[PDB]
Design a protein around this ligand. Structure first.
Ligand SMILES: CC1=NC(=O)[C@H](C(=O)NCCNS(C)(=O)=O)C=C1
Length: 165
């Protein structure tokens, strides 16, 4: 069912995350981490203190799909074990901000064709698939987008609900 999912998403904030490739999303799914450029890191840290859940919705460039969504479990931190991201040409590891711990809520994909009826007011009401890395998605659009994903029966949201407290 979808009731615990709706509870997690209640009054959440949502951010679109772009990855240059699938390798980085695979690493994020395996290790429960993400790192973004400092401009976006600042927004995510602010949002983490402001809302019960901050949701990252991932899309690999040119894939025509979203690859899942996850909830921030911490603000960003530095000085951990190096994650071997396969970074875009022109982006060094030193250019990234810190590392956010994340809990995956859905590891299933959603094709852009299924979200064509959703627009993001914070990006000029363009289709939600359209947007820059780090773009905030307004509450109602973000909630409906997350609810379109196929259910991920491998995930138990009981563990995430207790972190919201
Ligand atoms: C860890 C990681 N973080 C990212 O943020 C990545 C990205 O592809 N971001 C959007 C492109 N940014 S850029 C400066 O235009 O090339 C990829 C890996």
């Amino acid at each position: 069912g979808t009731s615990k999912l709706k509870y997690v998403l209640q009054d959440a904030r949502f951010f679109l995350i772009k990855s240059n490739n699938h390798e980085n999303v695979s690493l994020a799914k395996a290790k429960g981490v993400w790192s973004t450029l400092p401009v976006n890191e600042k927004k995510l840290n602010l949002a983490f203190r402001s809302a019960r859940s901050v949701i990252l919705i991932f899309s690999v460039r040119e894939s025509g799909k979203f690859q899942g969504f996850a909830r921030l479990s911490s603000e960003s931190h530095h000085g951990g074990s190096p994650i071997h991201w396969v970074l875009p040409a022109g982006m060094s590891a030193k250019m990234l901000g810190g590392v956010f711990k994340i809990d995956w809520i859905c590891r299933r994909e959603l094709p852009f064709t299924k979200s064509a009826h959703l627009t993001n007011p914070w990006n000029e009401h363009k289709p939600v698939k359209i947007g820059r890395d780090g773009q905030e998605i307004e509450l109602e659009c973000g909630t409906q987008l997350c609810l379109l994903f196929p259910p991920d029966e491998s995930i138990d949201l009981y563990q995430v609900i207790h972190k919201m407290r």
